[PDB]
Ligand binder design. Sequence first.
Ligand code: BYC
Ligand code: CL
Ligand code: CL
Ligand code: FE
Ligand code: FE
Length: 472
Amino acid sequence: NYSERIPNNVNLNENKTLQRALEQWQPSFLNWWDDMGPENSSNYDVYLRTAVSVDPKGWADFGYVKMHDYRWGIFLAPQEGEKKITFGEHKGQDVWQEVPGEYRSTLRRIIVTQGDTEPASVEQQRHLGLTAPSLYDLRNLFQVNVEEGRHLWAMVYLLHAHFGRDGREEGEALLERRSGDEDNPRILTAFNEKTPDWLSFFMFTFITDRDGKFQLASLAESAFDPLARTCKFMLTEEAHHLFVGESGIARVIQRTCEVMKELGTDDPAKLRAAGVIDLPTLQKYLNFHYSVTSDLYGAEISSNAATYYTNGLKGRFEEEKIGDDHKLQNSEYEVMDVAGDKILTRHVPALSALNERLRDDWITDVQAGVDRWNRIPAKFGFDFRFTLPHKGFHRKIGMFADVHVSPDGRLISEAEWTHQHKNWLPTESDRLYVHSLMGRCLEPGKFANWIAAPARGINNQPVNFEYVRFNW
Ligand SMILES: CC(C)(COP(=O)(O)OP(=O)(O)OC[C@H]1O[C@@H](n2cnc3c(N)ncnc32)[C@H](O)[C@@H]1OP(=O)(O)O)[C@@H](O)C(=O)NCCC(=O)NCCSC(=O)c1ccccc1
Ligand SMILES: [Cl-]
Ligand SMILES: [Cl-]
Ligand SMILES: [Fe+3]
Ligand SMILES: [Fe+3]
């Protein structure tokens, strides 16, 4: 009987039924945010960006707000006159403003899946704030959290506007599942794991948000133009999430590098006696997050992924730049093949291999970031370089699900895996050591010993700016 205004650029107030249904959902979102959102944050004033438009020349306001009061809203890319579908059997036909009946349940399931990862990530990350290495980093965490939240609103809008009764019902159930719960877990495995320390947070935003970039880019070409327009704008916001992850780790590497030079050493035990995260341990964290995330792209060879492209529901990454016929009935793609005791390659029909193409696009983007990290050790004259493990290492989805592959690409026995994987994935004692460094640091402009200062602040504010005010 008091209803918050929902900001949007979709003219929500013109469609009273849709406005009332979303208002009916809002209090439940707020209840979920208060219980599963960032712990103890109810009174904090945080310096945050809030979307107020979709102009690529200034679409966000920056100012202090309490997160429970954050102005979540619905923002789609601008509609385009007579926009056409650009791939699949529907190529050249007009885009859709409502979902065709034959595609309803598939498109709904895609949209639900995407929506579910959003509150999941917040649930995984809600305790991080208590051990934040700086007010800068606490603010970045919170910004990622409020945006995760807006991405739930984004999908819930679509479910209500375009999927009828079950759409409403999906929206409620999106707040009823919980990451790691035994009875109602979240949908994807990776979104039921713990994010137990800030090193994992930075790797998750560097690597796992990037799956989000590539899935969202694929949906941004959807023939279902309301979904396309939603996803286009989500990609604009997700770029900052990828920067938090990439620069986080860069900053850890820098610090470790600094201490290697100052102590004149390489010895991990001496480096840990100084409270830095040694580069080989970092490499295991990269191995873990990379491999686990890679599974999210799905089976390398897939009939479903074929139908999603042919039917026009999900494009390829940067579909419009690709120089083929955008239908693919006579196209090929090269994938791996487990060939007895060897890993070989083989060509398969392109339509059947779309999940592998998207995985490969994602690998290339991760490698470009890893190349940028490796400038730091090079700067210092150190030999160490970060690498990506072979794509079959530590997989549970697809052709490698049942075998073991070492980071360097060898098929290995079950016993070689049990005795060697400690060199490749974080051990219990690695995880304990990383955890022992996680002390909160909250005075303006001070940074915990395990991570260097960032290059600049946020929204032209200084590095020492009071980015969270606590009202203790
Ligand atoms: C492409 C996927 C990912 C998977 O497609 P599907 O069709 O479901 O699966 P396939 O194409 O692999 O199916 C091939 C076949 O393999 C079968 N199979 C066997 N075992 C399994 C098994 N154990 N598990 C699964 N499948 C298994 C399967 O049944 C099928 O069998 P048949 O061939 O019929 O015999 C789809 O979910 C999609 O487009 N999602 C939308 C985008 C999305 O995910 N967005 C989230 C991005 S993150 C982000 O936003 C964010 C990040 C950080 C913070 C916040 C946010
Ligand atoms: Cl569904
Ligand atoms: Cl074996
Ligand atoms: Fe997101
Ligand atoms: Fe994100």
